[PDB]
């Protein structure tokens, strides 16, 4: 269950998530847009899903993309803040899961975000250990998809 | 005009928003649920819109309502963090406006949240001064609906 996936996040994993978020989460606009642009660059097949955002190749200049990207970072902020209470983490993960289920995003497709996350983390010198920690958090969302 | 509405957020208004948010934002789960339950209690005619959440009279015991309420508080955190840059505040307000436009929520009905905000703020010892400050931020969203 989602609860099982969440309840598994250990003290060490939570520490790595919080340490890396202190940095990447400090510039939500910059890193949020970087995450999205990287997703579109490496997984071009996902561009069609974001037609509401218009021309995503415009990057930071695209107001709809910027608004979406900043907001995405607050969804992550939400997850990070609920790490110590699995009950709260589960109900927020399920809420966001619905947002993607309605768009027909499968667990496998949601996992495509791991590549971009690994790259954005590396840009700030956070290695494989941190990318693995984030993959575990993404896995909690996948348990709900 | 969302831009003209954003222009109404003067130095004094921004300070009151930040000062009150430091307190209310410290307990997103508790105050978020309080805001929602107050909305449903005082404006029963809005309950129909929240059909997805199930039995909202259950309050904190309703997992979907709790997840929704916590997430709502992060939307407000987002707005507060964008106060320095009107261009970024506007793009995040418009992103959320779309979420409500698709739910058939008008500017007038969105404005019904002002009652609950004033009531909960008052229970925290924050008077009309602060309620009015928040009404100005709410007015920015209303301009986009
Ligand atoms: C770290 C992972 C991710 C986070 C935190 C995230 C966050 C969000 C948020 C907060 C929204 C707005 C929901 C709404 O207002 O309805 C959203 C929308 C969306 N997401 Fe994600 N998402 C993630 C990964 C993905 C991936 C990998 C895909 C696709 C392969 C995806 C596809 C979508 C689509 C299509 C929308 C709708 C965009 C629109 O039309 O406005 N998301 N996401
Ligand atoms: C302080 C003002 C408010 C904030 C910050 C707020 C925030 C939010 C957020 C973040 C969502 C989730 C969007 C999504 O995932 O699609 C949402 C959903 C929703 N909001 Fe609001 N909202 C506010 C006031 C209102 C008011 C006054 C109404 C109705 C009179 C309203 C009706 C809705 C509805 C119907 C949904 C969909 C719930 C669902 O089915 O999951 N909102 N709101
Ligand atoms: Cl600044 C506080 C806006 C507010 C949100 C939820 C409950 C009470 C007040």
């Amino acid at each position: 269950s989602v609860y099982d996936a969440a309840a598994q996040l250990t003290a060490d994993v939570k520490k790595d998530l919080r340490d890396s978020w202190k940095v990447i989460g400090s510039d939500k606009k910059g890193n949020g847009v970087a995450l999205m642009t990287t997703l579109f660059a490496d997984n071009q097949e996902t561009i069609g899903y974001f037609k509401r955002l218009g021309d995503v190749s415009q990057g930071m200049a695209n107001d709809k993309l910027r608004g979406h990207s900043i907001t995405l970072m607050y969804a992550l902020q939400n997850f990070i803040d609920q790490l110590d209470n699995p009950d709260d983490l589960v109900c927020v993960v399920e809420k966001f899961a619905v947002n993607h289920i309605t768009r027909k995003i499968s667990a496998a497709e949601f996992g495509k975000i791991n590549g971009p996350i690994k790259k954005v983390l590396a840009s700030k010198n956070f290695g494989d250990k941190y990318a693995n920690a984030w993959a575990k958090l993404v896995a909690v969302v996948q348990a709900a998809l």
Side-chain angles (χ1 to χ4, degrees), chain A:
Chain A
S1 67
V2 180
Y3 189 70
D4 293 317
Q8 78 93 303
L9 298 172
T10 62
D12 301 314
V13 171
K14 294 179 182 180
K15 170 61 171 171
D16 290 329
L17 288 170
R18 288 164 187 165
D19 283 350
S20 56
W21 185 248
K22 284 183 177 179
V23 180
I24 62 176
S26 63
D27 181 7
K28 295 184 172 64
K29 177 169 63 177
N31 293 319
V33 172
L35 263 175
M36 293 300 287
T37 55
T38 300
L39 176 70
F40 301 140
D42 300 326
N43 295 78
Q44 303 96 313
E45 76 281 359
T46 66
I47 295 171
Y49 289 130
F50 300 89
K51 64 184 186 65
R52 183 188 79 74
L53 307 185
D55 188 346
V56 298
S57 74
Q58 299 293 173
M60 196 67 79
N62 185 322
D63 63 310
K64 285 179 172 58
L65 175 56
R66 199 168 69 255
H68 166 82
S69 303
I70 290 173
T71 302
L72 180 158
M73 296 297 272
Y74 279 95
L76 294 181
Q77 179 69 57
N78 193 341
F79 295 165
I80 298 297
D81 288 343
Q82 315 315 317
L83 287 180
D84 295 314
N85 189 318
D87 296 312
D88 290 337
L89 179 58
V90 172
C91 75
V92 296
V93 166
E94 295 192 305
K95 177 280 183 299
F96 281 121
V98 173
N99 283 144
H100 292 78
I101 290 171
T102 58
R103 269 85 179 203
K104 308 308 300 176
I105 303 301
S106 70
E109 303 181 84
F110 192 88
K112 292 180 179 184
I113 197 68
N114 284 312
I117 288 178
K118 184 171 186 175
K119 290 189 176 183
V120 174
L121 282 170
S123 72
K124 294 301 185 302
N125 285 164
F126 286 104
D128 300 337
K129 172 162 163 269
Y130 293 93
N132 291 171
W134 279 90
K136 294 179 180 301
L137 179 56
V138 172
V140 178
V141 178
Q142 290 175 299
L145 298 172

Short mmCIF file of all heavy atoms in Angstrom, two decimals, chain A residues 7-53:
data_model
loop_
_atom_site.label_atom_id
_atom_site.label_comp_id
_atom_site.label_asym_id
_atom_site.label_seq_id
_atom_site.Cartn_x
_atom_site.Cartn_y
_atom_site.Cartn_z
N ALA A 7 5.86 4.37 5.16
CA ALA A 7 6.37 3.91 6.44
C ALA A 7 7.77 3.32 6.32
O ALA A 7 8.46 3.15 7.33
CB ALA A 7 5.42 2.88 7.04
N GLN A 8 8.20 3.03 5.10
CA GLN A 8 9.53 2.45 4.90
C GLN A 8 10.64 3.50 4.84
O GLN A 8 11.80 3.18 5.10
CB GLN A 8 9.55 1.58 3.64
CG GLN A 8 9.63 2.33 2.32
CD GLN A 8 11.05 2.50 1.83
OE1 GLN A 8 11.90 3.06 2.52
NE2 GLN A 8 11.32 2.02 0.62
N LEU A 9 10.30 4.74 4.50
CA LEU A 9 11.28 5.83 4.43
C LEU A 9 11.99 5.96 5.77
O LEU A 9 11.43 6.48 6.74
CB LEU A 9 10.58 7.15 4.09
CG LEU A 9 9.87 7.22 2.73
CD1 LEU A 9 9.07 8.52 2.63
CD2 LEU A 9 10.89 7.12 1.61
N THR A 10 13.23 5.49 5.83
CA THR A 10 14.01 5.51 7.06
C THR A 10 14.60 6.85 7.47
O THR A 10 14.58 7.81 6.71
CB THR A 10 15.16 4.50 6.98
OG1 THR A 10 16.04 4.87 5.91
CG2 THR A 10 14.62 3.10 6.70
N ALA A 11 15.12 6.91 8.70
CA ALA A 11 15.71 8.13 9.22
C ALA A 11 16.84 8.65 8.32
O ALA A 11 16.99 9.85 8.15
CB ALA A 11 16.24 7.89 10.63
N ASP A 12 17.61 7.73 7.75
CA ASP A 12 18.72 8.13 6.88
C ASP A 12 18.22 8.69 5.56
O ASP A 12 18.77 9.66 5.04
CB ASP A 12 19.65 6.94 6.62
CG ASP A 12 20.22 6.37 7.90
OD1 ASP A 12 20.68 7.16 8.75
OD2 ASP A 12 20.23 5.13 8.05
N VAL A 13 17.17 8.08 5.01
CA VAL A 13 16.61 8.54 3.75
C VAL A 13 15.97 9.91 3.96
O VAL A 13 16.12 10.80 3.12
CB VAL A 13 15.55 7.55 3.22
CG1 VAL A 13 14.81 8.16 2.03
CG2 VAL A 13 16.22 6.25 2.80
N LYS A 14 15.27 10.08 5.07
CA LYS A 14 14.63 11.37 5.35
C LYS A 14 15.69 12.46 5.52
O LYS A 14 15.49 13.60 5.10
CB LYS A 14 13.78 11.27 6.62
CG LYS A 14 12.58 10.34 6.47
CD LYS A 14 11.77 10.27 7.76
CE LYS A 14 10.61 9.30 7.61
NZ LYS A 14 9.80 9.22 8.86
N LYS A 15 16.83 12.10 6.11
CA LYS A 15 17.92 13.04 6.31
C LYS A 15 18.47 13.50 4.96
O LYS A 15 18.69 14.69 4.73
CB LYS A 15 19.04 12.39 7.13
CG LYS A 15 20.34 13.18 7.21
CD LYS A 15 20.17 14.54 7.86
CE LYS A 15 21.53 15.18 8.11
NZ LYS A 15 21.42 16.60 8.54
N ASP A 16 18.70 12.55 4.05
CA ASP A 16 19.21 12.88 2.73
C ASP A 16 18.20 13.72 1.94
O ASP A 16 18.58 14.62 1.20
CB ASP A 16 19.56 11.62 1.94
CG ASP A 16 20.78 10.91 2.49
OD1 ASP A 16 21.67 11.60 3.03
OD2 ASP A 16 20.86 9.67 2.37
N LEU A 17 16.91 13.41 2.10
CA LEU A 17 15.89 14.18 1.40
C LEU A 17 15.88 15.62 1.90
O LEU A 17 15.86 16.57 1.10
CB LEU A 17 14.51 13.56 1.62
CG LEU A 17 14.24 12.24 0.89
CD1 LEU A 17 12.95 11.63 1.39
CD2 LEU A 17 14.15 12.50 -0.61
N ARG A 18 15.90 15.79 3.21
CA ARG A 18 15.88 17.13 3.79
C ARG A 18 17.14 17.93 3.49
O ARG A 18 17.06 19.12 3.20
CB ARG A 18 15.64 17.03 5.30
CG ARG A 18 14.21 16.62 5.63
CD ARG A 18 14.02 16.14 7.06
NE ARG A 18 12.68 15.61 7.23
CZ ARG A 18 12.28 14.87 8.26
NH1 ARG A 18 13.13 14.55 9.22
NH2 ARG A 18 11.03 14.43 8.31
N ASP A 19 18.30 17.28 3.54
CA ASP A 19 19.55 17.98 3.25
C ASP A 19 19.59 18.50 1.82
O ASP A 19 20.00 19.63 1.57
CB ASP A 19 20.76 17.08 3.51
CG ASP A 19 21.08 16.93 4.98
OD1 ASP A 19 20.49 17.66 5.80
OD2 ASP A 19 21.92 16.07 5.31
N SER A 20 19.18 17.67 0.87
CA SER A 20 19.20 18.08 -0.53
C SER A 20 18.10 19.10 -0.82
O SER A 20 18.29 20.01 -1.63
CB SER A 20 19.07 16.86 -1.46
OG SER A 20 17.92 16.09 -1.19
N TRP A 21 16.95 18.97 -0.15
CA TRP A 21 15.86 19.91 -0.38
C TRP A 21 16.20 21.31 0.12
O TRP A 21 15.72 22.31 -0.43
CB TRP A 21 14.57 19.42 0.29
CG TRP A 21 13.39 20.30 -0.04
CD1 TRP A 21 12.71 21.10 0.83
CD2 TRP A 21 12.80 20.50 -1.33
NE1 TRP A 21 11.73 21.79 0.16
CE2 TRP A 21 11.77 21.44 -1.17
CE3 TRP A 21 13.05 19.97 -2.60
CZ2 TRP A 21 10.97 21.87 -2.24
CZ3 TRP A 21 12.27 20.40 -3.67
CH2 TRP A 21 11.24 21.35 -3.48
N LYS A 22 17.03 21.40 1.16
CA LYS A 22 17.43 22.71 1.68
C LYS A 22 18.02 23.54 0.55
O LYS A 22 17.79 24.75 0.46
CB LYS A 22 18.51 22.55 2.77
CG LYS A 22 18.01 22.09 4.12
CD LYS A 22 19.17 22.07 5.10
CE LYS A 22 18.73 21.67 6.50
NZ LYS A 22 19.89 21.64 7.43
N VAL A 23 18.77 22.87 -0.32
CA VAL A 23 19.41 23.52 -1.45
C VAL A 23 18.51 23.65 -2.68
O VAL A 23 18.25 24.76 -3.14
CB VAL A 23 20.69 22.75 -1.86
CG1 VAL A 23 21.36 23.44 -3.05
CG2 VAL A 23 21.66 22.69 -0.68
N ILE A 24 18.03 22.54 -3.21
CA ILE A 24 17.19 22.60 -4.40
C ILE A 24 15.87 23.33 -4.16
O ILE A 24 15.35 23.99 -5.05
CB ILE A 24 16.91 21.19 -4.99
CG1 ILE A 24 16.15 20.33 -3.98
CG2 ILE A 24 18.23 20.53 -5.37
CD1 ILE A 24 15.76 18.96 -4.53
N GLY A 25 15.34 23.23 -2.94
CA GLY A 25 14.09 23.90 -2.64
C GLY A 25 14.23 25.38 -2.34
O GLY A 25 13.22 26.08 -2.17
N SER A 26 15.46 25.87 -2.28
CA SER A 26 15.70 27.28 -1.98
C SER A 26 15.50 28.18 -3.21
O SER A 26 15.37 29.40 -3.07
CB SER A 26 17.12 27.48 -1.43
OG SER A 26 18.09 27.11 -2.39
N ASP A 27 15.48 27.58 -4.39
CA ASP A 27 15.25 28.33 -5.62
C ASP A 27 14.21 27.55 -6.40
O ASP A 27 14.52 26.85 -7.36
CB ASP A 27 16.54 28.45 -6.44
CG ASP A 27 16.35 29.24 -7.72
OD1 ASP A 27 15.26 29.81 -7.93
OD2 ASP A 27 17.30 29.29 -8.53
N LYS A 28 12.96 27.66 -5.96
CA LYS A 28 11.87 26.93 -6.58
C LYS A 28 11.61 27.29 -8.04
O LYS A 28 11.34 26.41 -8.86
CB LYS A 28 10.59 27.10 -5.74
CG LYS A 28 10.71 26.46 -4.36
CD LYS A 28 9.41 26.56 -3.58
CE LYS A 28 9.48 25.77 -2.27
NZ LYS A 28 10.49 26.30 -1.31
N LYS A 29 11.69 28.58 -8.37
CA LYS A 29 11.47 29.00 -9.75
C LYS A 29 12.57 28.46 -10.67
O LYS A 29 12.29 27.85 -11.70
CB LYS A 29 11.42 30.53 -9.84
CG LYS A 29 11.27 31.05 -11.26
CD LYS A 29 10.95 32.55 -11.29
CE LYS A 29 12.07 33.39 -10.70
NZ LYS A 29 11.76 34.85 -10.83
N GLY A 30 13.82 28.66 -10.27
CA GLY A 30 14.93 28.20 -11.08
C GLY A 30 15.03 26.70 -11.24
O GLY A 30 15.16 26.19 -12.35
N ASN A 31 14.95 25.98 -10.12
CA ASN A 31 15.05 24.53 -10.18
C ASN A 31 13.78 23.84 -10.66
O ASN A 31 13.84 22.75 -11.23
CB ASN A 31 15.49 23.98 -8.82
CG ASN A 31 16.90 24.40 -8.46
OD1 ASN A 31 17.79 24.40 -9.32
ND2 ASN A 31 17.13 24.75 -7.20
N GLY A 32 12.64 24.47 -10.44
CA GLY A 32 11.39 23.89 -10.90
C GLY A 32 11.34 23.91 -12.42
O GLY A 32 10.95 22.93 -13.05
N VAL A 33 11.74 25.03 -13.01
CA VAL A 33 11.74 25.14 -14.47
C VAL A 33 12.81 24.23 -15.05
O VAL A 33 12.61 23.62 -16.10
CB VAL A 33 11.98 26.60 -14.91
CG1 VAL A 33 12.17 26.66 -16.42
CG2 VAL A 33 10.79 27.46 -14.50
N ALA A 34 13.93 24.11 -14.36
CA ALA A 34 15.02 23.25 -14.82
C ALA A 34 14.53 21.80 -14.87
O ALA A 34 14.84 21.06 -15.80
CB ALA A 34 16.22 23.37 -13.89
N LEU A 35 13.77 21.39 -13.85
CA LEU A 35 13.24 20.03 -13.80
C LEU A 35 12.34 19.76 -15.00
O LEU A 35 12.49 18.75 -15.69
CB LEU A 35 12.45 19.81 -12.51
CG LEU A 35 13.18 19.14 -11.35
CD1 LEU A 35 12.26 19.11 -10.13
CD2 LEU A 35 13.58 17.72 -11.75
N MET A 36 11.41 20.68 -15.25
CA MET A 36 10.48 20.53 -16.37
C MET A 36 11.17 20.55 -17.73
O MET A 36 10.89 19.71 -18.58
CB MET A 36 9.41 21.62 -16.31
CG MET A 36 8.47 21.51 -15.12
SD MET A 36 7.55 19.95 -15.09
CE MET A 36 6.40 20.22 -16.40
N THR A 37 12.07 21.51 -17.94
CA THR A 37 12.77 21.59 -19.22
C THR A 37 13.60 20.34 -19.48
O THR A 37 13.73 19.90 -20.62
CB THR A 37 13.68 22.84 -19.29
OG1 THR A 37 14.59 22.83 -18.20
CG2 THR A 37 12.84 24.10 -19.25
N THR A 38 14.17 19.77 -18.42
CA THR A 38 14.97 18.56 -18.56
C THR A 38 14.06 17.38 -18.91
O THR A 38 14.43 16.52 -19.71
CB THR A 38 15.75 18.26 -17.27
OG1 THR A 38 16.62 19.36 -16.98
CG2 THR A 38 16.60 17.00 -17.43
N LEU A 39 12.88 17.34 -18.31
CA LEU A 39 11.94 16.26 -18.60
C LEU A 39 11.57 16.31 -20.08
O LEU A 39 11.51 15.27 -20.75
CB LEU A 39 10.66 16.41 -17.76
CG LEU A 39 9.57 15.38 -18.05
CD1 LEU A 39 10.00 14.01 -17.56
CD2 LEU A 39 8.27 15.80 -17.38
N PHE A 40 11.32 17.51 -20.59
CA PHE A 40 10.93 17.67 -21.99
C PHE A 40 12.08 17.39 -22.94
O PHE A 40 11.86 16.96 -24.07
CB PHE A 40 10.39 19.07 -22.24
CG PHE A 40 9.19 19.42 -21.40
CD1 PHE A 40 9.05 20.68 -20.84
CD2 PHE A 40 8.19 18.47 -21.19
CE1 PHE A 40 7.93 21.00 -20.08
CE2 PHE A 40 7.07 18.78 -20.42
CZ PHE A 40 6.94 20.05 -19.86
N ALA A 41 13.31 17.63 -22.49
CA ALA A 41 14.47 17.41 -23.34
C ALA A 41 14.81 15.93 -23.48
O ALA A 41 15.14 15.47 -24.58
CB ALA A 41 15.66 18.17 -22.79
N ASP A 42 14.74 15.20 -22.38
CA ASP A 42 15.07 13.78 -22.38
C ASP A 42 13.90 12.84 -22.66
O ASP A 42 14.11 11.70 -23.07
CB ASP A 42 15.73 13.39 -21.06
CG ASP A 42 17.01 14.16 -20.79
OD1 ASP A 42 17.73 14.47 -21.76
OD2 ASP A 42 17.31 14.43 -19.61
N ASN A 43 12.68 13.32 -22.44
CA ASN A 43 11.49 12.51 -22.69
C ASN A 43 10.50 13.32 -23.50
O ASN A 43 9.43 13.70 -23.02
CB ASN A 43 10.85 12.06 -21.37
CG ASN A 43 11.75 11.13 -20.57
OD1 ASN A 43 12.70 11.57 -19.92
ND2 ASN A 43 11.46 9.84 -20.64
N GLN A 44 10.86 13.57 -24.75
CA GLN A 44 10.04 14.36 -25.66
C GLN A 44 8.61 13.82 -25.82
O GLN A 44 7.70 14.58 -26.15
CB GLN A 44 10.71 14.45 -27.04
CG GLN A 44 12.12 15.04 -27.01
CD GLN A 44 13.21 13.99 -26.97
OE1 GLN A 44 13.15 13.04 -26.19
NE2 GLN A 44 14.22 14.15 -27.82
N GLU A 45 8.42 12.53 -25.58
CA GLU A 45 7.10 11.93 -25.73
C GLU A 45 6.09 12.43 -24.70
O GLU A 45 4.89 12.20 -24.85
CB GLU A 45 7.19 10.39 -25.68
CG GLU A 45 7.39 9.78 -24.29
CD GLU A 45 8.83 9.86 -23.79
OE1 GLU A 45 9.71 10.36 -24.51
OE2 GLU A 45 9.07 9.40 -22.65
N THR A 46 6.57 13.13 -23.68
CA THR A 46 5.68 13.65 -22.64
C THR A 46 5.17 15.06 -22.92
O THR A 46 4.24 15.53 -22.26
CB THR A 46 6.37 13.68 -21.26
OG1 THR A 46 7.44 14.63 -21.28
CG2 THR A 46 6.91 12.31 -20.90
N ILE A 47 5.76 15.73 -23.90
CA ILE A 47 5.37 17.10 -24.22
C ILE A 47 3.87 17.25 -24.49
O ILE A 47 3.25 18.21 -24.02
CB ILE A 47 6.16 17.62 -25.44
CG1 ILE A 47 7.64 17.73 -25.06
CG2 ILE A 47 5.62 18.98 -25.89
CD1 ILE A 47 8.56 18.02 -26.23
N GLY A 48 3.29 16.30 -25.21
CA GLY A 48 1.87 16.36 -25.53
C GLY A 48 0.94 16.48 -24.33
O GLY A 48 -0.14 17.07 -24.44
N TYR A 49 1.34 15.91 -23.20
CA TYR A 49 0.52 15.96 -21.99
C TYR A 49 0.37 17.36 -21.42
O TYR A 49 -0.58 17.64 -20.69
CB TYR A 49 1.12 15.07 -20.90
CG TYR A 49 1.01 13.58 -21.14
CD1 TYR A 49 2.12 12.76 -21.02
CD2 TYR A 49 -0.23 13.00 -21.42
CE1 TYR A 49 2.01 11.38 -21.17
CE2 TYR A 49 -0.35 11.62 -21.57
CZ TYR A 49 0.78 10.81 -21.45
OH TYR A 49 0.66 9.45 -21.59
N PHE A 50 1.32 18.23 -21.74
CA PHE A 50 1.32 19.59 -21.21
C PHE A 50 0.87 20.66 -22.20
O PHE A 50 1.35 21.79 -22.15
CB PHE A 50 2.72 19.91 -20.70
CG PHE A 50 3.20 18.99 -19.62
CD1 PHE A 50 3.87 17.82 -19.93
CD2 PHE A 50 2.94 19.28 -18.28
CE1 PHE A 50 4.28 16.94 -18.93
CE2 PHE A 50 3.35 18.42 -17.27
CZ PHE A 50 4.02 17.24 -17.60
N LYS A 51 -0.06 20.31 -23.07
CA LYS A 51 -0.54 21.26 -24.06
C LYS A 51 -1.16 22.53 -23.47
O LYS A 51 -1.16 23.57 -24.11
CB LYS A 51 -1.53 20.59 -25.02
CG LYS A 51 -2.81 20.08 -24.39
CD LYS A 51 -3.65 19.35 -25.43
CE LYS A 51 -5.01 18.94 -24.87
NZ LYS A 51 -5.84 20.13 -24.52
N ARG A 52 -1.67 22.45 -22.24
CA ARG A 52 -2.27 23.62 -21.62
C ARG A 52 -1.23 24.71 -21.37
O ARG A 52 -1.55 25.90 -21.35
CB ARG A 52 -2.93 23.27 -20.28
CG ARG A 52 -3.64 24.45 -19.61
CD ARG A 52 -4.09 24.13 -18.19
NE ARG A 52 -3.00 24.19 -17.22
CZ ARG A 52 -2.45 25.32 -16.78
NH1 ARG A 52 -2.89 26.49 -17.22
NH2 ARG A 52 -1.46 25.28 -15.90
N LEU A 53 0.02 24.29 -21.19
CA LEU A 53 1.10 25.23 -20.91
C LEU A 53 1.62 25.97 -22.14
O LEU A 53 2.42 26.89 -22.00
CB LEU A 53 2.26 24.50 -20.24
CG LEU A 53 1.91 23.69 -18.98
CD1 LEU A 53 3.20 23.15 -18.37
CD2 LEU A 53 1.17 24.56 -17.98
#
